[PDB]
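DATA SHEET
Item: assembly model
Revision: 1
Owner: S.N.
Input lines:
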Amino acid sequence: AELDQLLQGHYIKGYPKQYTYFLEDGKVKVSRPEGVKIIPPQSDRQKIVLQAHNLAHTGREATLLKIANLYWWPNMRKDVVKQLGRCQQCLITNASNKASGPILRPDRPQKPFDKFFIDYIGPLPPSQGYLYVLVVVDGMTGFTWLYPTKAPSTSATVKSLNVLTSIAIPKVIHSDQGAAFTSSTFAEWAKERGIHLEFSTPYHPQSSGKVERKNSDIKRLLTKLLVGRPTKWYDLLPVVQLALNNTYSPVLKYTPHQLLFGIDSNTPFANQDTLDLTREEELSLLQEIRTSLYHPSTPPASSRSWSPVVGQLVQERVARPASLRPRWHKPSTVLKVLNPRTVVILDHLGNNRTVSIDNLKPTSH
Amino acid sequence: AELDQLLQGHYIKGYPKQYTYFLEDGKVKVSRPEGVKIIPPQSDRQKIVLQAHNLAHTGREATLLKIANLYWWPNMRKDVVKQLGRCQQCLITNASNKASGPILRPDRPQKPFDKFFIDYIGPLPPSQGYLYVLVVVDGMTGFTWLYPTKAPSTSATVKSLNVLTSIAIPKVIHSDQGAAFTSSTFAEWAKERGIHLEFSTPYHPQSSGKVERKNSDIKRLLTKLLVGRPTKWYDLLPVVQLALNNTYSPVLKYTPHQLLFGIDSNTPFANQDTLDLTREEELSLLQEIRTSLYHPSTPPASSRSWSPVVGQLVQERVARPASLRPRWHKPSTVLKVLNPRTVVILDHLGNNRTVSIDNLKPTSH
Amino acid sequence: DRPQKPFDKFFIDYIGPLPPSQGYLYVLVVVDGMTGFTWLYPTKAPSTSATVKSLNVLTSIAIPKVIHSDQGAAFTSSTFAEWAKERGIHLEFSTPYHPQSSGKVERKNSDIKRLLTKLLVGRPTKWYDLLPVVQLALNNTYSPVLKYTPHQLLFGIDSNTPF
Amino acid sequence: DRPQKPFDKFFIDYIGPLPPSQGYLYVLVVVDGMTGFTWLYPTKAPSTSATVKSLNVLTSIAIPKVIHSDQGAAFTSSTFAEWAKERGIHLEFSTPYHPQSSGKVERKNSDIKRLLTKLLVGRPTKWYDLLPVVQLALNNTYSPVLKYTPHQLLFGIDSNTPF
DNA sequence: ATTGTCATGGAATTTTGTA
DNA sequence: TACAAAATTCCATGACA
DNA sequence: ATTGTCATGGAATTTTGTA
DNA sequence: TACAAAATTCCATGACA
Ligand SMILES: Cc1nnc(C(=O)NC(C)(C)c2nc(C(=O)NCc3ccc(F)cc3)c(O)c(=O)n2C)o1
Ligand SMILES: Cc1nnc(C(=O)NC(C)(C)c2nc(C(=O)NCc3ccc(F)cc3)c(O)c(=O)n2C)o1
Ligand SMILES: [Mn+2]
Ligand SMILES: [Mn+2]
Ligand SMILES: [Mn+2]
Ligand SMILES: [Mn+2]
Ligand SMILES: [Mn+2]
Ligand SMILES: [Mn+2]
Ligand SMILES: [N+]
Ligand SMILES: [N+]
Ligand SMILES: [Zn+2]
Ligand SMILES: [Zn+2]
């Protein structure tokens, strides 16, 4: 082939002179620092790299190290990497070595009832025939409503929320994509009332994080109230609700209740500071506090993170991976970038999916 | 009580003068920057702090903030913290805010067969009536043996290992405290052969980490070999075994097989570098390589870590916490400190337990 | 004195009996003394028992310093009397047949009764499912004094359902 | 030439039939040409089939360049012939009735036969469970040349079971 | 009575073929 | 005594029930 | 089509009562 | 223009299926 010229002492791009290139057993051999290696004809080299790789479906360095034993040619790795990009198997099974970008800290809703966050807790031990708790948190104040249910169902969610909205109607309800909230029956209940439904990306509880974080505090306090006793939580819910709604956030120096009403009710240790102000004076002082609330900023990027660029080869993690089956879906493309942490992708194949980076890896190579 | 003196203008330790201390409704009140607060008599103050705390079993700041509303006395927090230490409930339910110390990187075994690490994988999909894989890794070389089993049982473990030890006998076998290896039947099998059994602390797979990390690589390669096909792994095991034993660790620049034998067998891409050395020359070159192997050091301490001191109040995490029940056991004491990461504790109550810090929190207060 | 505030006083009374809806018969009416904010709770009887169950709900949100009521059997009972002492609520009673309560409350209390009969007729059997809508309407309705909805006085912001 | 190495050549042969143990009848004997390291595999018949199953085990550890054997039906068959080509093993055959193999191997191959009859008698029925102990003994036994156990030559370290 | 490990692929650092 | 670009080494990230 | 949150308890930093 | 020690604020760690 093109190796012909080389044995005859003539130069080629790559193939550095100073090494003697000889012939043995009808193969083109070369003396190198590392030792004497064989140089395959261009047309054999893909076939070689593949054979080596397919032994254990090894990465760049592991593959090259096998090939190094027998062969040499110019730009060995460039070729190896060309293969690692085409191994359908390695791409959908290997995990990522790139962390996703810094999280986002969306702003506090401005007014109470601007946005509700909901979620179901459970199943729990049966009390009084009930198994789940519906937790509703006001995004602004952190004020929380609890409702015992027998199942995490659309029907029961509606029953509960009808009671709640007797007090006021929210602009927006944010939920996970759990069966209870995605149903058409709910969607309409919500439209009937002029409430916008909003859902977090699939398999990302962190988005419903404001409720989730209240779940923690609920389960924790119930646990504490039930040490010793049999797990009879039903009758405790009210107490928990109250207790938690009147608990100071050390960062804010305010109980949710305070942020919702601007005065403490007839609770234990009710703060009197505003006892002298008319309701009006008080009410605007409250309106001030609400705006001047502490708000976190996003954290520094981890040193090896990635951000999603439009038209990027990107892969979605498998829902519920089966035993011994690939942890990732085939490659798919970034359609739009909703924010540095949420992406729309044309998937398998193909529907627009809204997804969180945390469920994505960049296709490598 | 002792508050008598104060209303009369005489000084007391704490109780700073400059504020006017008056009487209203038979209570001792005080004008302060924050406002006008009540000062309880010493004997009432524990009862006060407890009432406040018991509302939501809140921490230091949350508790104090309630009390601040109504009362004032000197060193308020000192008292609050005294309570947080005695609330049996908060201690066994709250999580830690202190990370455990930097991990340890024990040294490579010196010789092959110095130490075997074992573990069971499974259950898997049934192939040929088998459900689990017994994975044995040589600590020194990383060389691995695989054995299909129908159950993760003592009896089957013995059967498998009898085959393995036909080749050579190890000094030590390290395992998790899984039923199969803790049994008396195994313990004797092992003593019969003069093999020391050694077990990692309870619920800390990281200790069996050398095998665990091989499990990853096994499941990964099997997954890759089974994309498309039905999960027929039984007949694949041999291939995997070979493939993995002849895979270069990029850090070491050596396949396990090489570290075990000092020469490559009749494998694809078998390295020829030592083809000219007598067995002897080769054998000592190998003996050199083994000692000069790359060995990691422990990582920097995380900024808020803790280390176990002898006679420290320390608590063990619950095995399999029930729903709504405390995530931690009652306080217990550090008996001896085996290493900066392993502790012996007098538990509940009381037996000597060997435990990893990762399953411990320091009792706070 | 000290100016009046929400949760200072809760006025309670029973409306009923009504035509059965979902097997309910009575409405327990709770108006907040200062704001005029209203809660409505359907009950099966004007009994201490049903009062307690209902007020347990409301008192998960807030606890008044005072409850005012007529001397109806339900509120005079010793069980209700104990219920309130437990929660640290002082109880206040109008004298028999001379029902003294706030100017603002009498009016709101009248509105409820009208608004109930109004949308009761035509569907006298399905007033249960309507209670949310009613409560919402009442609480978001401009008082001639203040030009504020009870909603506004309680929360110090605008509702997303005006009238 | 190039000095001799482990895995260069594997000598294989069948010992049997023996008194049945655990329903096994034959022992397939594999000695490594250079080290003298020995594997023993119990089989139910001196058949290509049982040879393949056995050698599949051994070849999970290492693959020889060459296998040498007598012209027994099991090794001459075309199935064995294909098995070896697949794994890239060249096959080598002694001529009939003149069994040429290594000086070192003949001796080791003799030792096995003696050591088998020795501890066979007295428990002729329970030789299966003993095969590990035998293999271990053989491989950790000092050769008069080298003063090295086959174990030492293979692994370049000392075993924790000397003899 | 004991204890984390290490393939992976971009980045970052060093060595290389030529002056 | 110096360059661009290949070849190597570094190392955070993730997952082994 | 959307997005993490925040109680907790030592450490670290600021304010306080007295000169 | 100053100190020791209380009172406050900072913030990593962990957990909400
Ligand atoms: C579509 C679609 N199909 N399935 C899902 C899905 O998300 N499923 C899981 C099992 C993960 C889930 N989890 C939680 C939850 O709270 N988990 C714990 C947690 C909370 C916070 C935090 F930061 C991390 C973890 C739910 O509430 C929940 O409803 N689901 C369904 O979405
Ligand atoms: C006593 C006693 N009772 N129960 C345990 C116990 O440890 N149980 C678990 C379920 C945790 C377990 N896990 C693994 C495993 O490999 N887990 C995954 C992993 C591997 C490495 C790493 F760093 C983190 C996680 C096992 O092999 C195993 O046998 N077990 C029993 O000990
Ligand atoms: Mn949910
Ligand atoms: Mn949840
Ligand atoms: Mn295990
Ligand atoms: Mn394991
Ligand atoms: Mn009445
Ligand atoms: Mn024969
Ligand atoms: N936002
Ligand atoms: N060690
Ligand atoms: Zn591959
Ligand atoms: Zn507590």
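QC remark: Residues 16-18, 58-62, 81, 84, 94-98, 304, 364-365 of chain B lie near DNA strand G (CB under 10 Å from a C1').
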